[PDB]
Amino acid sequence: LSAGNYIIYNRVLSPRGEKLALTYPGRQRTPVTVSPLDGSSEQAWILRSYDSNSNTWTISPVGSPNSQIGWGAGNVPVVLPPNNYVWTLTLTSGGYNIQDGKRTVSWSLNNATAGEEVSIGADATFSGRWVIEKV
């Protein structure tokens, strides 16, 4: 895994079979959601290596490339002005487990539906795992 632009989508598809991709809501301090994979810029993220030895990274929307995803009140990711907000990206045999820098919580989807806000908390079979693809 290396720096560049990526899509990030859940292992669990929508009820209609759509890949549910991390989607920038177009402004800061607004819960980041998933939506059907569609090639829009809101679904492209810049990963920058923070500590390679820690597998930690910053994640920035291409639309606002200096901004970073942080841990929002309500336990949802939100985009913010930069301040070393990082996530651990661990490749497991079930896909990526996206955790905070201290590896105490995980991103998941509760229902895996279009428009759903990403949850930060307990790890979850299947919906706690993600796919990260270049470009």
Q: Which residues bind its own copies (CB under 8 A)?
A: 9, 11-13, 15-17, 19, 93-95, 111-112, 125-127, 129, 131, 133
Q: Shortest Cβ distance from residue 78 to its own copies (Å)?
A: 25
Q: Cα–Cα distance between 31 and 53 in angstroms, integer?
A: 29
Q: Cα–Cα distance between 78 and 31 in angstroms, integer?
A: 5
29 binds, among its own copies, Cl ion, none (CB under 5 to 8 A by kind): Cl ion
What would you report as the CA-atom Rg of the chain, rounded to the nearest whole angstrom?
Answer: 13
Which C-beta is closer to Cl ion: that of 73 or that of 122? 73
Q: Identify which of 91, 84, 67, 86 has the alpha carbon closest to the alpha carbon of residue 1.
A: 91
Q: Answer yes or no: are the C-beta atoms of 86 and 57 closer than 8 Å.
A: yes
Q: Which residues bind Cl ion (CB under 5 A)?
A: 29, 72, 78
Which C-beta is closer to Cl ion: that of 76 or that of 124? 76
User: Rounded to the nearest 5°, which phi and psi values hold at 63?
Assistant: -65, -25
102 binds, among Cl ion, its own copies, none (CB under 5 to 8 A by kind): none
Which C-beta is closer to Cl ion: that of 7 or that of 78? 78
